[PDB]
Enzyme design. Structure first.
Site, PDB file in Angstrom:
ATOM      1  N   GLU A  58      24.796 -11.788  19.546  1.00 57.93           N
ATOM      2  CA  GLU A  58      24.820 -12.029  20.739  1.00 57.93           C
ATOM      3  C   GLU A  58      23.375 -12.061  21.350  1.00 57.93           C
ATOM      4  O   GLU A  58      23.023 -12.886  21.719  1.00 57.93           O
ATOM      5  CB  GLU A  58      25.739 -11.127  21.688  1.00 57.93           C
ATOM      6  CG  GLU A  58      27.174 -11.219  21.608  1.00 57.93           C
ATOM      7  CD  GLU A  58      27.762 -12.426  22.074  1.00 57.93           C
ATOM      8  OE1 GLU A  58      27.292 -13.612  21.522  1.00 57.93           O
ATOM      9  OE2 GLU A  58      28.699 -12.325  22.854  1.00 57.93           O
ATOM     10  N   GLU A  92       0.918  -1.203  -0.051  1.00 56.83           N
ATOM     11  CA  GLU A  92       0.177  -0.064  -0.144  1.00 56.83           C
ATOM     12  C   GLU A  92       0.850   1.198  -0.058  1.00 56.83           C
ATOM     13  O   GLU A  92       1.735   1.328   1.059  1.00 56.83           O
ATOM     14  CB  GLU A  92      -0.822  -0.063   1.347  1.00 56.83           C
ATOM     15  CG  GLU A  92      -2.202   1.060   1.250  1.00 56.83           C
ATOM     16  CD  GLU A  92      -2.834   0.924   0.007  1.00 56.83           C
ATOM     17  OE1 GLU A  92      -3.529  -0.104  -0.025  1.00 56.83           O
ATOM     18  OE2 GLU A  92      -3.198   1.774  -0.858  1.00 56.83           O
TER      19      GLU A  92
END
Ligand code: GTP
Ligand code: GDP
Ligand code: ADP
Ligand code: ADP
Ligand code: ALF
Ligand code: MG
Ligand code: MG
Lengths: 428, 428, 355, 334
Positions: A245, A62
């Site tokens: 991490e 859109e």
């Protein structure tokens, strides 16, 4: 330079990213035009001239949302080429954005992200902002995310899919979109941070205390959440935990990668005056039984591991003392396999807020990220909703008429069901 | 840009369309000449979806006006906002279908539908992207009903992907103005449900009582009825043509309101229904507006929801309101109207806030429900059909126009089938 | 041994009867000979517990950790070594029932390369169900001329694609509509269909051959629905009766998911067919009061074949390969579900012309 | 040898499956040829609509046009040219099923003089159902001997006249009652009945002759006793396999029904109602409303096979009862 990029798609995600970049520019001191009167190197791509264009491609089926950021002050920040538009959206149909519309659109965004990766020195991952019940947020993103794994996959794609509101389903077919996108996301999802809008409403009532907060207010909460999340990369800190991490810290299992976000200083300015903003008090606030960003029961959910993005004037010493008391708390429950997942991304950069920002500016903050089995119940109810709708084949004609298959629906059902079994198996 | 093309049929269709384009021009600040004199540049944001710009600020309304008696279009010329149309569009016949569906489908209607299809398709490729067709007409007269069905067959075969948001005025339960309307409406809806995907039930006496009692009107002139349906019709698409926090379009609702292909008829609505000067006896706000939007008193046909269940609802909330309060309100109505509510499909609501409100009105919503309450309307229509069919009551007019009772029996069977589907899913 | 042979042959005849006599939906799972290239690419495991039960083991990597025994019991399971005659001997009694005055419908369910044409068309190599049933029907016709019954054959060829009905016999673009007959509300006919009176098997072969080139001219063959309606009327002048029966040869399209190599609108029509069929059959299993026959053209056209006085067949053409193992086992699930389904009681058409 | 009869066992088993699939309760019509003493008797207009349907018309043109249609369909129609072997051809599958553990009922229905007795009993020149059935049963038992199956036949002869049971194998009049079986609540037995063990076809022929002699038939001698009584002969099959067990308990209930002409009808009407209810799959079947239905209750279940014969006299004076019998038969086919 540990440079990373973010992508945005769907009504939810483009505005989310806009507010997120608002705080990013706030702590980088960069104007909407892209000049800073370093820390943006990872995000805002400072060009040869004084133009720091944040690494953010906003692509939606859109174009209205691309038009809204074009009219947004960050029109210069959001590179126009990075702003990919479209014609019809994807309806509330993953299949529409997975096999008919987004299927070809992903290729255009692939060029955008891959050229951004070429400009990027060392890509860390992908900050995809979207929803689960959203048609583009489901099919388009799931195909986009899985294509990112095909293109690279090594990059720690940090998925950020807004959890579909359970009490009020904006889309009657939200369950299908959610289960279908996960069917094509779970396998490639490195670490999917989860946030539910209803939980933010509850936070805006118990902490933010705003009687009438718009979606921009929800995005402001997310803005502080992601600001603290990537604070480690943008700003040095006692312990900098990156997306790589984050995956190891939050997701301990290939399929178990749905930690709910949590921000301690989400209290209103008056509540900020009410509280002493103590490190211990905010640690408890980020571990309160009603601070989870997803509609789940953390007390009843075993936490695989919690990642606290502590920032501001905080030292790991005080964090260790506060978290030690929280570890002893019986209400706080961790999986038997990993009952000591108290890893904290402690940072020494105080969190800033956008001028007029609903969230009170506090000298310190902690973005707690808890991967808990409490979300298994939320996944179960989503699967259940899809099951009862699929039981009598409701709205299936639309999906199958857009490239979906009843066999894939059954695959999605068992995938989600197996995910619940994986969650409880991690808990015990 | 996902444009839409407008069709008018029968004097009702033409008049309601006239007032409809007047309303749209008011929305976009369009002078009766065709030149833009509004102040909000946002009115030009999607102006192309209705007003195709021709030259020098003169925007041609994308309107196709079809009829077999010139009088209505002559009034349109004389009427204001009639000359604003490009005169090429006024493609009409001369004789008149004479409230005969067979005449509207094989006599003059056949030649004119044949004559206009070229113009409408030329306008179609004149536009960039298309969504659907609004066959703004009524089943009251044989003309608009017939030629419209002849047109919908051509429209569907040439443009099947397009979603036809046709609006129709269902024959009044008490006011049987057309003696052969039982045969007419039935012949129409046969072909409709064979092709169409969304109709509506508008009763002349329903709006009569609404304006009399809710609006406190004394002279229910058709002008009021045309304005009411036009206002609701605009709200249907304001989400598409205008920006908003959570934007929807024709495609969203199109894939959301239909659990099944055939089960695709709906009841519209709007709010608020304040009287001429009731501004004091209540205070305008979205709680009370929602409260008075979902009641049977604010319905659109004589179909009492007290005999049906809301299968799905598509409330739009054009304006600026609270997502929360609508959530708790739909919660409350679900709790209290659970009996008048599909238990088989939960979590059914389509809140689609669109930022810009109507003119001079701060708050507004358009209700759209697929309530399982039409089956009584089809039951009474089938009863009238069979009662006039036992004696072939004034069947000579139709049979003489090269037609056979074969299709009458088939249409009656299919209407029984729709009744069966409605009752079966309302019960189950 | 002669008595042993008579006993085992009589029992074999009882096997053929029970299948159709009980039924009432004969779901058949025929496994085609796996293609050598597709074998060496990737293949799955199958074990036939009996002549009517098949277990498509697989259980390799994902089926290993996610699924168990794919044992599915049916009416008849065909080995890859099964011949065209092997699948045809069970169609012959149903063809006899059709010529008795009953409506018969045949479906070939499978993905691309399954062998649906090898079942119906029979494939250039050897012959298929269509030529075999034509020869059998003509033989029974002459036998009943020896019994005093005169039978006329009407053939209508129709192709369903992207919701638009196409006439396989004429190249002219014509508007097709399917409508129930005026004489009865149950039987449904299609308007403006090219109808021809079959004169001899040679002309039937010629018209089938031409229609097959028109089909190939119209990879659309793997994804387009072919409907063949053979209407037989049997006049007995001495008895003054008319026996009315119909044969519905339906060639279904590939049931594969869109994946990548697929186009939009064709896939959407295939989903119309499969999803509406699944919903209506599930409702039938549910004993629902109303069955929505008028959502898709497919179920409306075969409303008599699915909800009327007819006996219909399921042919589950399954590729025994692991890559398609998921789609294949989904097909087996649906095939078992429809094996549990029930057909509306078939009615023999007897019409005395005394008046 | 072993494999031959194993294949035979599988074959006959699936034969009973086909029979249950058919739904049993098969109705047939038989027409007796006129005798030398009835050549001067007015017949009916019998136009044969194939061998599965037959309709009868009255010769009287004043009455022929006033009854409309008299067409009745059957599973098989017997003409006067049909021999007793033609009737027995469809009894042998039922006897084979009885050998397999199923209960079989053989019924002959019609007015007095229709031919029910010679449909069941027959003449020495052309034997009826009883001798052919016993011969085929003994041949089947001799065949079963080769696989180890040991079959013992227990024959009981009884008569029902006025809802009172009478033993035809003994003149010692006693009181016999219909009681639920000890090892099966669905099976039945009657007390005090002489249950002789058949050793050879000669033994059962002697037993049948003794039962007929003790019956004191009066069907034509006053039309009082035999013409209004039910002749129920029961043959029970008890087969035991060595080292296999799995006994097969089946019974043959060949019943010679009493006259259906207008004047006991107490048992006949109850049998008609029970048959109609079985055809309608009625939940409750009034088995205990009559002695005849209560006696045959275990032999009228779902697995049990019921056989019906509708004998009609092709005579004008028998038209009014022939049409009633054909209407009763047509209550089955529709
Ligand atoms: N926090 C937040 N949530 C939003 C926002 N806009 C939409 N949502 C949520 O998104 C969901 C509705 O789906 P959308 O985001 O409209 O869907 P989409 O991703 O645009 O995809 P389509 O359905 O194809 O239009 C609901 O859960 C909304 O609450 C926003 O600005 N902020
Ligand atoms: N709401 C509304 N209904 C109208 C209006 N004018 C006519 N109608 C209704 O619609 C019918 C006209 O149907 P139409 O197809 O236009 O008539 P035709 O062209 O003469 O065949 C009338 O009989 C009324 O029931 C109007 O202005 N508003
Ligand atoms: N029994 C068989 N023997 C040889 N080839 C076969 C057999 N069954 C299927 N095939 C092969 O499978 C292929 C599929 O052909 P076709 O039936 O036209 O397509 P589909 O199977 O998709 O309908 C054919 O090329 C044919 O050679
Ligand atoms: N198939 C037949 N062939 C020759 N005669 C028959 C036949 N059937 C019945 N009859 C004659 O009909 C007479 C009446 O006996 P029948 O009708 O069998 O007794 P019931 O009235 O008990 O049935 C017998 O004397 C017999 O000769
Ligand atoms: F390949 Al096909 F029908 F599936 F010809
Ligand atoms: Mg093919
Ligand atoms: Mg007698």
């Amino acid at each position: 330079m540990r440079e990373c990029i973010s992508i945005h798609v769907g009504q939810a995600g483009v505005q989310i990213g806009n507010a997120c970049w608002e705080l990013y520019c706030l702590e980088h001191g960069i104007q909407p035009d892209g000049q800073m009167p370093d820390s943006f190197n990872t995000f805002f791509s400072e060009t040869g001239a004084g133009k720091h264009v944040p690494r953010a491609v906003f692509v939606d089926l859109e174009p209205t949302v691309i038009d809204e950021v074009r009219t947004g002050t960050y029109r210069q920040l959001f590179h126009p080429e990075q702003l990919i538009t479209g014609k019809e959206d994807a309806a509330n149909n993953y299949a529409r954005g997975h096999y008919t519309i987004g299927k070809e659109i992903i290729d255009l965004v692939l060029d955008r992200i891959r050229k951004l990766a070429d400009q990027c020195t060392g890509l860390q991952g992908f900050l995809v902002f979207h929803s689960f019940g959203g048609g583009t947020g489901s099919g388009f993103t799931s195909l986009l995310m899985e294509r990112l794994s095909v293109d690279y996959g090594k990059k720690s794609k940090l998925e950020f899919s807004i959890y579909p509101a359970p009490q009020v389903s904006t889309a009657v077919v939200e369950p299908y979109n959610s289960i279908l996108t996960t069917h094509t996301t779970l396998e490639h999802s490195d670490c999917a941070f989860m946030v539910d809008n209803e939980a933010i409403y509850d936070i805006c009532r118990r902490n933010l205390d705003i009687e009438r907060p718009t979606y921009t207010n929800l995005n402001r909460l997310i803005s502080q959440i992601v600001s603290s999340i990537t604070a480690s990369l943008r700003f040095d800190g006692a312990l900098n935990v990156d997306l790589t991490e984050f995956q190891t810290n939050l997701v301990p299992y290939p399929r178990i990668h749905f930690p709910l976000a949590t921000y301690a200083p989400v209290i209103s300015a008056e509540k900020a005056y009410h509280e002493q903003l103590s490190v211990a008090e905010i640690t408890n606030a980020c571990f309160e039984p009603a601070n989870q960003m997803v509609k789940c029961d953390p007390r009843h959910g075993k936490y695989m591991a919690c990642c606290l993005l502590y920032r501001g004037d905080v030292v790991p010493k005080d964090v260790n003392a506060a978290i030690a008391t929280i570890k002893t708390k019986r209400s706080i429950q961790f999986v038997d396999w990993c009952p000591t997942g108290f890893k904290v991304g402690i940072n020494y950069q105080p969190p800033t807020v956008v001028p007029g920002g609903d969230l009170a500016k506090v000298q310190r903050a902690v973005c707690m990220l808890s991967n808990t089995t409490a979300i298994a119940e939320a996944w179960a109810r989503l699967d259940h909703k899809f099951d009862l709708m699929y039981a009598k084949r409701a709205f299936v004609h639309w999906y199958v008429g857009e490239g979906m298959e009843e066999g894939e629906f059954s695959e999605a059902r068992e995938d989600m069901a197996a995910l619940e079994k994986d969650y409880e198996e991690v808990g015990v | 840009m996902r444009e839409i093309v407008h069709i008018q049929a029968g004097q009702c269709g033409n008049q309601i369309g006239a007032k409809f384009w007047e309303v749209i021009s008011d929305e976009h600040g369009i002078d009766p000449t065709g030149t833009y004199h509004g102040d909000s540049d946002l009115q030009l944001d999607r102006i192309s979806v209705y007003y195709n710009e021709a030259t020098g600020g003169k925007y041609v309304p994308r309107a196709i006006l079809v009829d077999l008696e010139p009088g209505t279009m002559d009034s349109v010329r004389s009427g204001p906002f009639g000359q604003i149309f490009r005169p090429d569009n006024f493609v009409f016949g001369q004789s008149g279908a004479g409230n005969n569906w067979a005449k509207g489908h094989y006599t003059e209607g056949a030649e004119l539908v044949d004559s206009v299809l070229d113009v409408v398709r030329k306008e179609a490729e004149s536009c960039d992207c298309l969504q659907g067709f609004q066959l703004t007409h009524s089943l009251g007269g044989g003309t608009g009903s017939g030629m419209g069905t002849l047109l919908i067959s051509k429209i569907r075969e040439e443009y099947p992907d397009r979603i036809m948001n046709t609006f129709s005025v269902v024959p009044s339960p008490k006011v049987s103005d057309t003696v052969v309307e039982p045969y007419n409406a039935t012949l129409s809806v046969h072909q409709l449900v064979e092709n169409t995907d969304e109709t509506y039930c508008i009763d002349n006496e329903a709006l009569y009582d609404i304006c009399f009692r809710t609006l406190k009107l004394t002279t229910p002139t058709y002008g009021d009825l045309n304005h009411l349906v036009s206002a609701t019709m605009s709200g249907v698409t304001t989400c598409l043509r205008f920006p908003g926090q959570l934007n929807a379009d024709l495609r969203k609702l199109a894939v959301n309101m239909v659990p099944f292909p055939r089960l695709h008829f709906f009841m519209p609505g709007f709010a608020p229904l304040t009287s001429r000067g009731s501004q004091q006896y209540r205070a305008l706000t979205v709680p009370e507006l929602t409260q008075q939007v979902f009641d049977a008193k604010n319905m659109m046909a004589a179909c009492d929801p007290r005999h049906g269940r809301y299968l799905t609802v598509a409330a739009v909330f054009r304006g600026r309101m609270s997502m929360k309060e609508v959530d708790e309100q739909m919660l409350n109505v679900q709790n209290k109207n659970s009996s008048y509510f599909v238990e088989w499909i939960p979590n059914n609501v389509k809140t689609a806030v669109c930022d810009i409100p109507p003119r001079g009105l701060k708050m507004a919503v358009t209700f759209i429900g697929n309530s399982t309450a039409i089956q009584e309307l089809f039951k009474r229509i089938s009863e009238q059909f069979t009662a006039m069919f036992r004696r072939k009551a004034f069947l000579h007019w139709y049979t003489g126009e090269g037609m056979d009772e074969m299709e009458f029996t088939e249409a009656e069977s299919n209407m029984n089938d729709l009744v069966s589907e409605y009752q079966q899913y309302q019960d189950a | 041994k002669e008595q042993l042979f008579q006993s085992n042959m009589e029992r074999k005849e009882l096997h053929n009867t029970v299948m159709d006599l009980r039924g009432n939906i004969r779901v058949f799972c025929r496994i085609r000979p796996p293609l050598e290239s597709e074998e060496n690419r990737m293949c799955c495991t199958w074990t036939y517990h009996d002549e009517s039960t098949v277990e498509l083991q697989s259980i390799d990597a994902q089926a290993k950790s996610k699924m168990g025994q794919q044992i599915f019991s049916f009416d008849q399971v065909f080995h890859p070594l099964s011949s065209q005659s092997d699948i045809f001997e069970m169609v012959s009694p149903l063809i006899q029932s059709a010529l008795d005055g009953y409506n018969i419908c045949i479906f070939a369910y499978g993905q691309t390369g399954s062998g649906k044409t090898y079942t119906m068309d029979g494939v250039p190599e050897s012959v298929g169900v269509i030529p075999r049933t034509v020869d059998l029907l003509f033989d029974s016709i002459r036998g009943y001329r020896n019994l005093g019954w005169e039978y006329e054959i009407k053939a209508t060829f129709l192709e369903i694609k992207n919701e638009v009905l196409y006439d396989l016999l004429s190249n002219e673009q014509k508007d097709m509509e399917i409508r129930m007959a005026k004489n009865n509300k149950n039987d449904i006919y299609v308007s403006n269909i090219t109808e021809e009176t079959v004169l001899d098997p040679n002309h039937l072969r010629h018209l089938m051959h031409t229609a097959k080139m028109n089909r190939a001219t119209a990879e659309r063959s793997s994804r387009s629905h072919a409907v063949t309606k053979l209407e037989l009327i049997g006049r007995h002048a001495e008895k003054q009766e008319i026996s009315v029966g119909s044969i519905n040869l339906v060639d279904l399209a590939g049931s594969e998911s869109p994946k990548t190599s697929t186009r939009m609108t064709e896939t959407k029509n295939i989903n119309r067919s499969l999803s509406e069929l699944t919903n209506v059959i599930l409702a039938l299993l549910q004993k629902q009061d109303h069955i929505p026959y008028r959502n898709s053209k497919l179920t409306h056209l075969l409303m008599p074949s699915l909800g009327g006085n007819s006996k219909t067949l399921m042919f589950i053409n399954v590729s025994p390969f692991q890559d398609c193992f998921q789609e294949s086992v989904k097909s087996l699930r649906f095939a078992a579900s429809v094996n549990s389904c029930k057909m509306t009681k078939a009615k023999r058409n007897r019409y005395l012309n005394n008046s």
